[PDB]
């Protein structure tokens, strides 16, 4: 009951008792799932570590990195997520350029909410597990991604731990990548959200005299998002079975000098159109 476990709720939330138990709910002008809440229109930061074991192209020896930092910035209701990942080796930096979804999950979490639809943070409170896989059509193997989000920590930071393992095609040193606007469908069912999407991306050759023509490639993203929802509050409206994420203004960049990988994108969440 609340009298016993009010501390389980966010300080910016209200507690309510029910037959089988209690549930938390963010107060007016705050968004979240009750256990975690943030003020509307406020800037938020996400921090965590990144470790990987990635085979590039046809290499039989993987590039390994641990203790790499991930820092992301967003402003509630603006819809744009900016992610930086640094201490990323040049040996893998360019080949990770097409993987904007590494930071894209943060865009899903804070997408601009339209009509009667909720973004990732409203649904999970930033407490969830993301299992993702990506297959590059025409190339061997696949890349597996696992990310754990643990809510807002003692410092006020949202949290995210990232693990990457597998094989990705080789992208020429100094090349750049372009991704056009797209939409993704997120299906909900009993505390589980899934999505699968096949998209294309363009690779532009190294910016030097004689740069050859650009070329496109295709990959398929598959992901499963798991989390907990309060099992009480019978009079609780069910979440939509399907929500559409609209993505645009995508930018990806890798800088060899500072060895930093950057991803940026704009997001809106609403009905299927």
């Amino acid at each position: 009951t609340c009298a016993n476990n009010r501390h389980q709720c966010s300080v910016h939330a209200e507690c309510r008792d029910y037959a089988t138990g209690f549930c938390c709910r963010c107060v007016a002008n705050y968004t979240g799932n009750g256990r975690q809440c943030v003020a509307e229109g406020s800037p938020q930061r996400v921090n965590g570590k990144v470790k990987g074991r990635i085979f590039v192209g046809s290499s039989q020896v993987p590039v390994v990195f641990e203790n790499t930092d991930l820092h992301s910035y967003v402003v509630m209701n603006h819809g744009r997520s900016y992610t930086a990942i640094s201490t990323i080796p040049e040996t893998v930096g360019y080949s990770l350029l097409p993987l904007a979804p590494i930071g894209g999950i943060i865009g899903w979490m804070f997408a601009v909410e339209q009509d009667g639809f909720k973004n990732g943070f409203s649904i999970t409170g930033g407490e969830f597990t993301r299992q993702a896989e990506v297959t590059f059509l025409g190339h061997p193997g696949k890349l597996v991604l696992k990310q754990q989000f643990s809510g807002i920590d003692e410092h006020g930071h949202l949290t995210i731990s990232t693990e990457l393992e597998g094989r990705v095609p080789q992208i020429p040193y100094g090349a750049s990548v372009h991704i056009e606007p797209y939409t993704e469908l997120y299906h909900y069912s009993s505390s589980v959200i899934t999505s699968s999407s096949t998209r294309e991306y363009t690779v532009m050759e190294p910016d030097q005299d004689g740069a050859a023509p650009s070329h496109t490639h295709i990959y398929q993203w598959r992901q499963t998002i798991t989390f907990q929802e309060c099992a009480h509050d019978d009079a609780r409206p069910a979440l939509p079975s399907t929500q559409q994420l609209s993505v645009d203004s995508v930018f990806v960049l890798y800088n060899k000098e500072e060895r930093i990988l950057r991803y940026a994108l704009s997001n809106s969440i609403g009905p299927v159109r």
Binding site: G41, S42, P43, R45, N47, D69, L70, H71, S72, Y73, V75, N77, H78, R80, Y82, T83, A84, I85, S86, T87, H157, S249, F251, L253, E258, R259, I260, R262, A264
Partner: protein, 89 residues
């Protein structure tokens, strides 16, 4: 932990229809840091605005675009801010 610098031409004046660009950079004691532009008080950028890697580009400027813009530098340790101003003829 982090220091922001709005590159020269912090104050610009253009006519309606032009494109304007503002640049932001920073010195950080941490490897991973971000640079993000917004209007004053964390106001939402115009739809015609593009913002990435510290570079803010506003295309086909409208009188309503006039005002102060803020570049926010951030890392796991702290944040810092610098400003720029736009005037429309």
């Amino acid at each position: 932990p982090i220091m922001v610098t709005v590159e020269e031409q912090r104050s610009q004046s253009v006519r309606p229809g032009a494109d304007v660009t503002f640049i932001c950079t920073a010195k950080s004691k941490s490897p991973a840091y971000t640079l993000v532009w917004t209007r004053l008080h964390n106001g939402k950028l115009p739809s015609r605005a593009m913002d990435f890697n510290g570079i803010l580009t506003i295309r086909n400027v409208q009188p309503s675009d006039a005002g102060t813009y803020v570049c926010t530098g951030s890392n796991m340790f702290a944040m810092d801010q610098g400003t720029a101003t736009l005037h429309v003829q």
